[PDB]
Amino acid sequence: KLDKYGSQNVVLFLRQLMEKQGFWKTPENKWVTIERIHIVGACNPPTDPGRIPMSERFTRHAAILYLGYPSGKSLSQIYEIYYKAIFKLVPEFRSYTEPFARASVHLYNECKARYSTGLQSHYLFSPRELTRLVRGVYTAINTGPRQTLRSLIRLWAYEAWRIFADRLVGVKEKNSFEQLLYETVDKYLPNQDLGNISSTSLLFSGLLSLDFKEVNKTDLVNFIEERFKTFCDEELEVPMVIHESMVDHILRIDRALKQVQGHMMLIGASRTGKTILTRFVAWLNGLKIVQPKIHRHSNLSDFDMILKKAISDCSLKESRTCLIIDESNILETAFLERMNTLLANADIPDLFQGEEYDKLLNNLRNKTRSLGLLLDTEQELYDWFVGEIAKNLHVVFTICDPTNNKSSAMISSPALFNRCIINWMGDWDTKTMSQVANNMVDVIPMEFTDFTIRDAVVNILIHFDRNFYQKMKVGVNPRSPGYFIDGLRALVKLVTAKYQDLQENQRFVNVGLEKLNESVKSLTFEKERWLNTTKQFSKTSQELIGNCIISSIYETYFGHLNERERADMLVILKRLLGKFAVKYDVNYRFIDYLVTLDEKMKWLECGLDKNDYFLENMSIVMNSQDAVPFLLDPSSHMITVISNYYGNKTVLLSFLEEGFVKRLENAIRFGSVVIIQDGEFFDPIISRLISREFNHAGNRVTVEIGDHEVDVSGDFKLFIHSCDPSGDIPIFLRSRVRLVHFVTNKESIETRIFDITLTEENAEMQRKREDLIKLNTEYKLKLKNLEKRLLEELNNSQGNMLENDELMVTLNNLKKEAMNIEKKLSESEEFFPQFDNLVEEYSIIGKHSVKIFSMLEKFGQFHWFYGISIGQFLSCFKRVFITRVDEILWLLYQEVYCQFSTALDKKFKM
Amino acid sequence: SPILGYWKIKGLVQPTRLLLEYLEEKYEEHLYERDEGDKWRNKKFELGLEFPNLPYYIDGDVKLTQSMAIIRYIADKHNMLGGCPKERAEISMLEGAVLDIRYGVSRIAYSKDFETLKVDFLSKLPEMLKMFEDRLCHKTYLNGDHVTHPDFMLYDALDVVLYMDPMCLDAFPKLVCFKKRIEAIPQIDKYLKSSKYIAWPLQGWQATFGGGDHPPFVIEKSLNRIKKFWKEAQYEVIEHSSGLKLVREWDVLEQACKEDLEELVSMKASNYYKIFEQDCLDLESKLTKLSEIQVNWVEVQFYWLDLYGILGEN
DSSP states (O other), rough: OOOOTTTHHHHHHHHHHHHSSSEEOOOTTEEEESSSSOOOOOOOOOSSSTOOOOHHHHHOOOOOOOOOOOOOTTHHHHHHHHHHHHTSSSGGGGGGGHHHHHHHHHHHHHHHHSOHHHHHHHHOOOOOHHHHHHHHHHHHHTTOOOOOHHHHHHHHHHHHHHTTTTTTOOOOOHHHHHHHHHHHHHHHHHOOOOOHHHHTTTTESSSSSSSSOOHHEEEEEEEEHHHHHHHHHHOOOOOOOOOOHHHHHHHHHHHHHHSSEEEEEEOOOTOOOHHHHHHHHHHTOOOOOEEOOOOTTTTHHHHHHHHHHHHHHHHSSSEEEEEEEEETTTTHHHHHHHHHHHHHHOOTTTTTHHHHHHHHHHHHHHHHHHOOOOOOSSHHHHHHHHHHHHHHHEEOOOOTTTTTTHHHHHHHHHHHHHHHHEEOOOSSSHHHHHHHHHHOOOOOOOOOOOHHHHHHHHHHHHHHHHHHHHHHHOSSSSSSHHHHHHHHHHHHHHHHHHHHHHHHHHHHHHHHHHHHHOOOOTHHHHHEEEEEHHHHHHHHHHHHHHHHHHHHIIIIIIIOHHHHHHHHHHHHEEEEEEETTTTOOOSSSSSHHOHHHHHHHHHHHTOOOHOOOOOOOOHHHHHHHHHSSEEEEEEETTHHHHHHHHGGGGEEEESSSTTTHHHHHHHHHHOOOEESSSOSOOOOOTHHHHHHHHHHHHOEEEEEEESSSEEEHHHSSEEESSSSSOOOOOOHHHEEEEEEEEOOOOOHHHHHHHHHHHHHHHHHHHHHHHHHHHHHHHHHHHHHHHHHHHHHHHHHHHSOOSTHHHTEEEHHHHHHHHHHHHHHHHHHHHHHHHHHHHHHHHHHHHHHHHHHHHHHHOOOOTTOOOOOOOHHHHHHHHTTTTTTTHHHHHHHHHHOOOOOOOOSOOOHHO | OOOOEEEEESTHHHHHHHHHHHTTTEEEEEEEOOTTHHHHHHHSSSSSSSSOOOOEEEESSSSSSHHHHHHHHHHHHHHHHOHHHHHHHHHHHHHHHHHHHHHHHHHHTTTTTTTTTHHHHHHHHHHHHHEEEHHHTTOOTBSSSOTTTTTHHHHHHHHHHHHHHHHTTOOHHHHHHHHHHHHSSHHHHHHTTTTTOOOOOOTTTSSSSTOOSSSOOOOHHHHHHHHHHHTSSOEEEOOOSSEEEEEEOOHHHHHHHHHHHHHHHHGGSSSTTTTTOOOOHHHHHHHHHHHHHHHHHHHHHHHHHHHHIIOOOO
């Protein structure tokens, strides 16, 4: 690149060498005249992306030769001689070299044409691929069992897949290649001995046999299963479900990690497991896993250190390392530049220069002789050093969103793109979703149903996740399954928590059935007639599976959605629950279902806002913590709420303070509840603390932070807090984080205008709305409170006199209470559909008012003095009271014009 | 099914228990719990062992006491003691070095000076572990490709020394391996996870080390590193043009003190610090006094040196 003025000095330096013939010495300050050195340069058309225009002042000294691609007929001729050489291994198919060479070129010609830089950037094909396929074929032959023609073509098909189609995104193109491969075999190698040529069906491996052979699908999966437990036990502890995609992907990385120079860059979205499979396949190949320990406050020197070691270990210690570089690791431009030098050249020159070159040069001679070969010259030794790196270091890149401009630069970088094997894991397929879901609901709380039952639940969640991304998210399929996994983990944790509580209360009414029968007298036979409740339980249990579906979805998918965006997804979920034979509570409320009246009091005591939205939010934060919650609120009124809840134990930090790095190690050791004040900024180190990763010890539980392994308490809690929604958190965090929005939106106006409208429209029913759900929960808590009071005295007074009678006149008062509930449930089914009839008129009022607030909000954007709060709009809408809907609407437009016209200038009035 | 009498603890029977589980052999126990010291005295003399003691084992008219005589028996009943002088002596040397760890525990476990006697044990431990790391260079287990009964002895030891030090293996990765390897052996792994496994204590409930129900903490290990650091405190000292000597590079100690003071205040959040806590309060009063005089001394040092430019020379 070129100075911001736009002048590339590197090129002018060469120009200096071409024209002048010597150059000026940069530190030492003299002229040195270069003798007998020539300058030759290669480059792409400068119409190409990445490419910079060169100065006519430099190119004026050069002879330019444009070399293009050859023939499509010379390519066919050239690779025949390539096949000729490799078929000296399988001489019985010497007549098959020409149709193989003609096919390889055809497959190339077509891939280049069908998958172009019009569809994706990385769709860039060349004769390099042909030669990559040719060698890929030989290596499989040179290390495979004697080959039938059916073997060789499938052998060729597998390499064709790995070279041309692993890079392909999505499925339309990937299917296209399957048929292209079929189309090409049919034209050049006509056999009915072929099978299913799709990558799922042809699996080639040297994991099972000594020879590289196509292996059986069942033989492989079982081989992985025995090895994964081992890798799980031996290395870091994380259990997973091995599925159809994963076996195909494990083989991909296996061939990569085997080849002399092995570079694969993996494009895996997030949570796909791109990083974990890499760790595994590396361990199966016996490659040391090196993972740069970077953070916000890492210098290039740090990364230099990390690289230098892994390079020195690869030649001078013969280590055989696998370097896993994530997109997060490349912090600055130079970091990537370093990575380039490591791939296009097989050394980083700058690390070892001058005296550090002499130290390296010395150490090199020691090990070379030790192994038994002396190398005379300076050049002879370096070429061993580099050649050793080239076979012992393996860099796997894991990039999640190639849409990101930092991750774009990885794929863009020529060094990286040419010497890497590009592989695509960008989405979870519906079959792999179902496979994973199945194994997660393998535990069986459930009971037979209408229609399979577990088969139905999984099909809903796939149809929900597919509807969630379809409706909510914008930007085209860069991001994929994460919530889905957490959604399933929530359901399992929720059904077990609910079914243990359902069977607990069913056990409390069964123990009360034994106690009333023992006694039998005048009122007690009504109590016995409490089969209404006993009959009721079965219908209550029927719905708990589908009720947990909604509750888990709320905890996972809803946290960061709008007032209306929550309700609307719920619709799509409920109608999905409606098609499937799962039974749910039609009068359902997320707050009442998962929040307890004791906790609901506790939260407000701190000073949580009364809003339903803010209740649901707080519920999502607390109730589930299998993962770290990310709280977003402009006014840090939330950061105080959590402070009043955890008290003394509340220790507040922010990613920005100096002492953060250490103060967290002290917070983790002694069970301190921690909130991090600036979520937007986030260093890599917390990262193992965000993913639930630990190393279990004799008594102690250790977590690795940057370097030192520190003890976790378990009474320790973690919260991350942010103030601006504009601030974007890294894809790593966002996926393992439970995102909850405490935001005072324009959507919040629609919700809150109806409450104020109904109090001045039908005061009787908005007043009875509060006590409807209040006395619903209160009387049911008093029903459970008086059942406990009755059982305590029945066990105390059984040998004593009829004291129980003095509680039975209170149980005579309960005949109002038990039946008060029944009185209110009857009028509820009458009240709710009337409530929902009244939502629509106010919606017509509601829709107008947001668009008005949006307009008054937009004035504050143009100018500073033109501010408006939501409260100013509310106060104004109250003034509207102190065809009815039509006149109230026109009362709003009038009152808004009356009050807010004052605070604008004559231009903005109009 | 052979019959073993011992404490309901790992104690002197653990390795044997593993060997048995290795040969998948089922067996029966006379377990003396922590508070069943009677049941033992009830059978102590009325059992017909040639050397009444714990543990005592009895099968096919093999009446045994002495953990060694027992283990060796099971070993010999499977032809595992060695095939020649050399391999036999090698297997005995394993036996020896394993006991030099299991017994080494009990000798500094009765000591009232435990948290400071372990210091002398852990200093010797390295030299012992090292030898094993070497032996395991170009080997899978000491004495060959197959783990044997002495590996079940070292495993009991390991299990116990991890409680005394969580970082005992960090210095010996070849053993950390050997340890996972053992845990991997089908029979063993199946056992550890079995219901018949009574996991703890390591020693007799009465012992200082590895006694009682279970491990609680970090507070000792941290405070040891704090006190260690403050008994090596050094100030670059530099005498200037005239008389007085000046203290260069304030910040380092200045920083450490504030940090180490904050560490002790975060110790108050912990549940387990209350009794151990009083000592920390004494270290708190010591450093809060050191920062009191740290603040003023840098002020003086600075204000004097400035004023020396002004009046000290002319």
